């Protein structure tokens, strides 16, 4: 939308980009549509970057006759998930793919059946963080993070939250229905304002230590 203000310095980084170099683990995968989930999904959302994903199944069979050919090792994932399969990242790898209203529009969404890179271990990862309980929250250096499941009950989801959004919380208190990513730390302090249903603040970009 063009630069309407001149600042003294540039932004540290963008969500989905690695910000520090160190030990790292990532695997490829393919995306399943939410409609294919058998017990139906109570929480829905797009396949947006910088959001958690869950394991779905194995698609390495590649055949239908009596002798099958296993020529590759592949896995497929779902946006919400209950079996953690990393966080989507590295936006420079993919393409715009266009948008519904018009192409050439900014978006982090990815179509179903596309291939992405999901990070399990990362020294520094810029992500988009959310807030729970609809109250002002200060994270500071060492809080934990969790992500919304597909099957989150509507009672525990009063604030409309995406399918796989990342939510930070203090050690003592955690929202009732969430899945905690083991051994993850906030690393970068951040403050978030109060929230309301339908008017959730998107939060601010933040560094992450996935493992």
């Amino acid at each position: 939308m063009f630069q309407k203000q001149v600042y003294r310095q540039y932004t540290p980084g963008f969500p989905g980009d690695l910000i520090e170099d160190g030990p790292k683990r990532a695997r490829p995968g393919r995306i399943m549509s939410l409609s294919a989930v058998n017990p139906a999904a109570t929480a829905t959302g797009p396949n947006r970057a910088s959001r958690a994903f869950g394991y779905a199944g194995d698609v390495s069979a590649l055949g239908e006759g009596q002798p099958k050919t296993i020529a590759a090792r592949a896995s497929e994932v779902v946006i919400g998930g209950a079996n953690f399969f990393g966080v989507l990242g590295h936006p420079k790898h993919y393409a715009l793919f266009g948008s519904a209203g018009d192409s050439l529009a900014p978006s982090y969404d990815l179509p179903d059946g596309a291939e992405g890179e999901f990070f399990d271990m990362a020294t520094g990862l810029v992500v988009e963080i959310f807030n729970g309980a609809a109250a002002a929250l200060d994270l500071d250096y060492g809080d934990l993070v969790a992500y919304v499941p597909n099957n989150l009950a509507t009672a525990d989801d009063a604030l409309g939250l995406p399918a796989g959004a990342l939510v930070g919380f203090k050690t003592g208190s955690m929202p009732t229905g969430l899945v905690q990513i083991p051994n993850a730390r906030i690393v970068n302090a951040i403050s978030l304002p109060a929230q309301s249903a339908g008017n959730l603040v998107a939060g601010v970009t933040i560094v992450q230590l996935t493992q």
Binding site: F2, Q3, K4, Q5, V6
Partner: protein, 52 residues
């Protein structure tokens, strides 16, 4: 990489003659033109005052 071009006007054509149709007791002509508006690439180099 491009030039400054803080403000510019995008014009495709100024006058186009579509055609003429002749009838028994009259005739009709048509004309057309096209434009795309104005572009502001650098809005930080513009200052405006509503008072005077």
């Amino acid at each position: 990489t491009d030039g400054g071009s803080v403000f510019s006007q995008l014009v495709q054509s100024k006058f186009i003659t579509l055609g003429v149709e002749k009838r028994a007791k009259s005739y009709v002509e048509d004309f057309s033109n096209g434009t795309a508006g104005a572009l502001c690439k650098r809005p930080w180099a513009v200052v405006r005052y509503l008072g005077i």
